[PDB]
Design a binder for these strands. Structure first.
Length: 70
RNA sequence: UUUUUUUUUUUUUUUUUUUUUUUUUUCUCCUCUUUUUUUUUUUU
């Protein structure tokens, strides 16, 4: 939690653009038919893991660029 | 006291052959309406 919170702190002091999409989820029972629909949401922990893997993939891309130029 | 005679089941067998699924019609034909076309993002 703390690590993610403050990786967020930094890379928003830089300043990202965090926006959203109109996404909905669907549950299907035994009969395979629509019990109900439910709008889904972005959760704190989604943001945490999103930024952890952003920074990860970022260092990855750095490594592989300085490692292979063209 | 009533003798004698009037044929019967066609003859024949020791002939060659080098093709081939099917088969033969039916004309030109008015697709109705918020749009440029949305798009990163993350959790599978």
């Amino acid at each position: 939690t703390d690590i993610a919170r403050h990786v967020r702190a930094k890379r928003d002091g830089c300043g990202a653009l965090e926006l959203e999409g109109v996404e909905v989820c669907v549950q299907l029972d035994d009969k395979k038919n629509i019990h109900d629909l439910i709008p889904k949401q972005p959760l704190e922990v989604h943001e945490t893991v999103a930024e952890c893997m952003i920074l990860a993939n970022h260092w990855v891309a750095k490594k592989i660029w300085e490692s292979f130029p063209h």
